Amino acid sequence: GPTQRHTYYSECDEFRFIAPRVLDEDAPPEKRAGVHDGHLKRAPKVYCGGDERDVLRVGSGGFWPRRSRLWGGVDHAPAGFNPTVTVFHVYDILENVEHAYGMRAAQFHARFMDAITPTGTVITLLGLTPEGHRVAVHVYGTRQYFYMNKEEVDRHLQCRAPRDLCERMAAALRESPGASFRGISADHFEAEVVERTDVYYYETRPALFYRVYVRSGRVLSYLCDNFCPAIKKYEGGVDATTRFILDNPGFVTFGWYRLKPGRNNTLAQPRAPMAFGTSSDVEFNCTADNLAIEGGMSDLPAYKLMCFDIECKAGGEDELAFPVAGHPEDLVIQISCLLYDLSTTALEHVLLFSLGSCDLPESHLNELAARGLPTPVVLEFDSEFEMLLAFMTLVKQYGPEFVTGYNIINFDWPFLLAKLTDIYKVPLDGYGRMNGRGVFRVWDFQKRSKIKVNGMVNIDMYGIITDKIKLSSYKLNAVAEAVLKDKKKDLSYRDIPAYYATGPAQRGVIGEYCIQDSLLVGQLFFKFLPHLELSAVARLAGINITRTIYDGQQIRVFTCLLRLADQKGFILPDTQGRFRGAGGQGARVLDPTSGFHVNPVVVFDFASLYPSIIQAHNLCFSTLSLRADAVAHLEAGKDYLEIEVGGRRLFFVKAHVRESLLSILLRDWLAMRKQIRSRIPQSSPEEAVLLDKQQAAIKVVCNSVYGFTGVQHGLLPCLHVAATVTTIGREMLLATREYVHARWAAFEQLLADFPEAADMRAPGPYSMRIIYGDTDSIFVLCRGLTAAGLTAMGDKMASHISRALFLPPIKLECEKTFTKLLLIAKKKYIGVIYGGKMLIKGVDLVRKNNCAFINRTSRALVDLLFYDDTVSGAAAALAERPAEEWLARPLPEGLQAFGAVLVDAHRRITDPERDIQDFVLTAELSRHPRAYTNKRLAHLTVYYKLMARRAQVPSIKDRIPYVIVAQTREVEETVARLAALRELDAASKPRKLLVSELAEDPAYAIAHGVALNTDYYFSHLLGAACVTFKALFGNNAKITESLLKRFIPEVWHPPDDVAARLRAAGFGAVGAGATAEETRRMLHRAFDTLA
């Protein structure tokens, strides 16, 4: 008797049987094709070694672990098992509306019911107990609520002191277009009058307000967009969670808790196991004030993690391909599923779902026993549904609190959910951590594809590694080789058909591959420990962990800023509309001069600039005014600041009349970060890492705030403050620029200010002069100083500025001292920090659309420009002329060994060895071939050359390794053979055959193909070389390429097919046939014959 129906398959007797007829081995070849797509009435069976049982079976024994004490409503955990847990953990907060009639039979006492009687919000605190047992705690006492001005609704709505307004609002819900809002009694809308000042426009004087209490979220988004637009009806968007979090001082959305008995002894209330609302081993429901935090208990009590990864066969009826979820012929064949533990990082179970008999290689079983990992459990299956249900019943049975994988939100979960929702028709609204009707969906948009499962924090790793590491290959195997360097055997899905039809050994070879892939992912997760960093942010901001993963960056800052305004008796509007949301200048002296700089470029980046500005200058919404009448009674120069951002002439008062919400917010957080970083050496190493996660969360959430305000048309945008923040940013960058030019533009004034500069003098002349500046960074170019002691003096320069001009919360910071630098663009440059490190800021030196040769020779080129001195100084001298003057003046000699690289990267492509195979130029074969509007692509040329010449094409989501050959002499005719076989039943120097018509395939090119094509390869090489090294020549791509192309010795021989004719005509030679002397006499002989 579950209260809420469970919408997972506790049992299924029938399914839609889809399985390759490759499965049978008595099915002679005609009956050995396609997928046997159909139907069967038998409970889905999983075979484990010798054994067999229903997939969907609890039983005494199982084939996978189980951590749910109900599964289908019959209790499973043993007779007693009442793990009293005062100190529970909370890893995730769900908020959902629990209509108190809909939780009639939950068998509470009457407190939690009384609270929420027609409808209310219940914030359920999913966590885990040090005893082990997963657990969930329901906090019932939260209301969303919101404010509207006092007269602006009394008069406008013409309805008196708030209960009358309350009824008006319920009338607006019920006297409405549709049945969405049902049976609203006013008393569901208890209101009050309040005084909160307006967060905006401080001369908006503290107003009298109406604060109407609204039980449910859905009623709030209707009262926020379906109630009169001509009052901005303050604070209606607010979640139930953030009201729960803020309103109760000290709480967190992640971290240990305590059940406190008080206030007439209302302890948290234990849940009857037939009233559980989740997959938890014990549950309780407890008003917000039956609850309490503790600190100093930082440890995650044995949470689990499923590192699953799927492999699918894409056979359709022909054209083995990428699968596609909408095709019942395209189907998953195996699923690896690696159930780790989170506290001890101990891989605990290795499951492997397999369609068919599957024999893991005896090497693999030995390998997994040798690295001490448990014995993989290969489950045989008969149908794709059997597998997908078995996997999904693991995700519910095990209930991995954390789920990881590579691309699981991009491909794996989208595939499995798409198979399970339209082909097999499975409700996924119960397979998360709430049994009935949670959220298990996946918003498509594209790769920021959002997956929301409730109580399963789907930490994908593609989305985590894409942030953490900054390679750009991002295929799992390359990623593991790059972070983990583990020496994996890689498989292709051109052996998925070969290995899946060969037999159980080879299907196990596929199984081995999927287990290796998921072990790689598990190793990734437990190296990066994403859950700790997200959990830090989730308990810092006020939001649940899932929310920090998926939704925005502004909800963090918004919820904390909401705590501030709640203490400071403020209101906060609901922007005049998110009219719907869908799922599925001062700077020109301060910009790049685009040059090379060997002089040590101190970098004075301001330290969290925009928060320091926001907190220095008291910028907020509540410090702003717009008429100087609003600062009529406050002196200028002490009590305020008149800043004119676009002309608006805004007036941010200083602190001693009104404190800035944003200043106090950033101030408190920057103090916590300082304290924690002052706590690192006196902790144990695992706890130095834990505090590192904590301080990282503070840093991220504090740099967010400028984006919070500035970003237009979101949650509390105030473009005036962002405009000032950026405006003051530019004006302190300029104030720094002017001050630096002013005091310290004469070395002796520097040395009179900082005595340690005596020894820091360099031979040449002296200057501190900004050369670049952007956002929080100015790059002073301390010409005439040494690098060595510099950052020690930069830090004192930063201090001296930060206190001499700027207000106290501002700090400059000499982070770096680039001993060499190359200012490419407004955001591009390649420096070399003092201690020696090649910092490259966003010119992506490796281009995967260029081949391996090109990236390796171009990056060799850059590291020649930098690491080689006596080259780098010549690339320095390159910026003491106008770029064009370097066309007529030879380059400075130090660059010689620069050209000696390009002349190699040319020679290397025309040398005898005629490949080193990877010249790939991969295709990124945009999705669907035969619909490439432009046609005539290189990769399409090979696509149809394969479709004539020994094709093997996993066509649809796959790239082609493709080489360009040097207009081999027959290939014109072969492209015309294309120009009839492209058409697929539908002498005169033939125009310099288009490059994409010379795209011959690598394998065929190697086997016989010779004398590879310089012009396209070397030209793209120079395109990258010019893209980087144009900054030497003022971004003059023309001049850059003209100079770089002047490095290549170019040869001139006549074509021998007319040298032959001339040699039959007896022409004399003048040249470099290595008759040297001859050249002079034969040239005299030209003039004797011709004049």
Place this chain on the structure above:
Amino acid sequence: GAPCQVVLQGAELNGILQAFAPLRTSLLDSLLVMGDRGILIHNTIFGEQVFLPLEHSQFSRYRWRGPTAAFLSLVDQKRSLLSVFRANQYPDLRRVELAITGQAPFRTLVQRIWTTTSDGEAVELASETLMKRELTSFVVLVPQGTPDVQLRLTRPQLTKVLNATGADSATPTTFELGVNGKFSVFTTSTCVTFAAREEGVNAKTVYGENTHRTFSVVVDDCSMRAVLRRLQVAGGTLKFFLTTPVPSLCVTATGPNAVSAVFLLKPQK
């Protein structure tokens, strides 16, 4: 500068700007083989070969000390060391000068310009001086010596010769000499003749050297009409080389300097 200096002062630069003047953008995508005894600028037009030797006497001061250096004309494939030499490109030219510094495998050319403006002051543009490296290995091929037959021609005569024979491919274009001092150039349809004479030591007497020798030669590809009318050749002289196993015939521009095209023939039937 370089050890090896070229300079054209206005007298000699007018004499060369006129050599490039009879009119072209042909020999802009060229090759210059420079050495002692001057610059040879070679190009291929419509397949066939064209030469323009620029003697060292034809410059004002020339000196090449060192082996030959071969420069592709088009510096970065857009400008040309001779794109200045056109008729009316910059009509203020007073002087141009070339210095090729460095050593025998790595000699690098710089070309400099000098215009005049009012009051006759001379201004070097620093944006129309070009610089081109040598070629590491070139191999250029050249004609030979005192020809096997030779005759003089004039703009009306040469017009008559080109228009007569030159009929497009599928038409074999046959030059021929007869006894009694006769020249004929005939094709499948048209047949124009000229008497060649001595005293070369109404429109059909020429005065030549090697006035005795006959031949019946045929050209195979049809370019004489079109190479010669692309260089805007205002007549000239024809010079036949028959010793080599395929004859080649070298039509020059008699008018003062030369752009000479040499032509390779069908094997005499």
Place this chain on the structure above:
DNA sequence: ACACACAGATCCCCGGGTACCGAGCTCGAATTC
């Protein structure tokens, strides 16, 4: 009976395309013999 929800996708380099510009070179009615 829940109403079910759902509450940001852009924009950069490489490769075709000849709108037209402009630059050459062969060209068809006024020139000079």
Place this chain on the structure above:
DNA sequence: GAATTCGAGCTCGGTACCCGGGGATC
């Protein structure tokens, strides 16, 4: 009492601007 050019207009090869779809891994 006998024929020619450079003029418009065509093509001509460009040619170089200048104008049209990219990435995102499984």
